[model samples]
Target: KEKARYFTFLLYPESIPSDWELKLETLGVPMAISPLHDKDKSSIKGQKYKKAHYHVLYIAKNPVTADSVRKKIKLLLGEKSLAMVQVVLNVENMYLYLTHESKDAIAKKKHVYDKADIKLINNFDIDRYVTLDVEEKTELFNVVVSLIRAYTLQNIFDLYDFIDENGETYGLTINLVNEVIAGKTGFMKLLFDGAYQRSKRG
Candidate 1:
């Protein structure tokens, strides 16, 4: 059997549950149900219902940026809430760790949620984005190559090469690769948008 790894985040009782579900689904990860022993049956001060901890799991393909994902979560849930410890775990061996909250803390302390790093994670429709299947990936790749070819013919050599190089380094393959090459997948599109704007100035 293959080894497993997990990533976790905490959400408020009043927060939107569907948003959380969508975030995990979009990333192609699974939500981890809290074990019975881990469930919070005890009440907290100023809170009516027992605050149960929720978790999510992902097979560790690469070390995910804890800060980045946390920022994404903060954006998804909005920046008005307090910084909370989110957990990550390895399902195969049951190892876990807490995600850092420095960005959230700073945002709260400065009262500047609008300008916070959390905004970096907010481009996609969390409710609609889903993991691409194998066939979808193939189609995406073809579309991406076609787009790259079009750009190449238009004298956009730098952008095309940049996409190709980064695509190779990121181990982008199948639909994911197509997404990057086509500039329509993940956070790369946002990143590329910034890059494109900067290039125009040069």
Candidate 2:
């Protein structure tokens, strides 16, 4: 007798990759989808990764329903929050994963971010922080502190958000070298209550 054990291979939320189901369907066994396959297109893209999907603890004790016969469902912020989200992933994948693109696209982002007690961002300005080589980022770190400072002003809307929007301090520090450019050293660590990037080992 062959025991066909089914596993829930949960992938993406609303934006579930275009071919994700098809790939799992290739598993050649009875399968189920969170939203099911026969339905029309959905609109859960950007907000899909908002929280830890499967592992999240959802409580629908008072779900949005007037029907007393049924139990409903439910689910679960800052630029410092935004900056923190970007840097944590940016830093972690730099060292934790192989490539930024791979990490950005492939990494189980929600879990790790939560593991670190970090928040999520809906989206950020693409031009603000483009991936760069060690030398380039270091240059952005030091020489262009002012440029980063400018981006800081832009991201947080002038330290009016916080002279604390100090992406500058993180950039200015020599996390990498000039003669030889190294890739991401490790997970992005921030301190002073998530106001700056953690630079020192001790």
Candidate 3:
């Protein structure tokens, strides 16, 4: 009963025309093209090498029929093209699959590609889709919480300083950092204040 606005197709380097990129750009919607998947091995037969291809994603402003997208994508195809554009069921899985960074890909031992190589076309914001999973977010939060417990955090400044120095290294998000900062007037502050109170008595 539900449909998504996202669509995707694969473009084989050998089959696509030289002007395919330019032609695709004229579609006038947010799009992203994956790095050339030259290292992908055939899933059917492990020893066989699959032809190099680029995964392309199209993000429309509204939900559209799969047939309509397929028709539009048909114009960009060359002779003997076997490509088929289809509606994306789960966009997060599709987007992460572009870099072989999806959970399925990792579990199957697929070659992990670099995110930097993804081509964001027509101002497609990749960062908007790239987010840590809930479990991943919880892990980072726990890491921060453990640090506070171990070090006896006193103030927000110390927390901010610690994050500034190690945020990138620990893959901390701005949202998480801001939460700790907010703890100054919230739960974190109370914890620190209590610790200080106890120390003064001893």
TM-score of each: 0.32, 0.16, 0.60
Task: Give the per-residue lDDT of model 1 (tens digit) for 60-176.
Answer: 345555555566556765663326433343232221211212344344342221212221122322222345666776665665545444443222345456556665643444445
- How do the residues 1-202 of candidate 2 rate in per-residue lDDT, one tens digit apiece? 2112111122234433454434433333232222222222234875533442221111111222222111111100111111101112233233222111235535543122222321112221222233466556666434333433334322223322333354355443232222212332221121121334322222
Task: Sort the candidates on lDDT, descending order.
Answer: 3, 1, 2
After superposition, the stretches of candidate 1 with alpha carbons farther than 4 Å from their true spots are: 1-5, 17-19, 35-39, 43-49, 58-60, 80-202
Query: What's the lDDT for residue 102 in model 2?
Result: 35
For each candidate, C-alpha RMSD in Å?
17.0, 19.4, 5.9
Pairs of colliding residues, candidate 3: none
Instruction: Kindly report which residue stretches of model 2 are placed more than 4 angstroms away from their true locations once superposed.
Output: 1-4, 13-16, 36-202
Error of model 2, residue 193, in angstroms: 82
Q: Residue 113, candidate 1: how far off, in angstroms?
A: 36
> Model 1 — which ten-residue stretch has the worst lDDT?
111-120
TM-score result, candidate 1: 0.32
Specify the highest-TM-score model's number.
3
lDDT for each of the candidates? Answer: 0.43, 0.28, 0.74
Q: What is the alpha-carbon lDDT of model 2 when measured against the actual structure? A: 0.28
Instruction: Report the Cα lDDT for residue 85, model 2.
Output: 10
Candidate 3: which stretches are off by over 4 Å? 1-3, 43-47, 79-82, 129-202
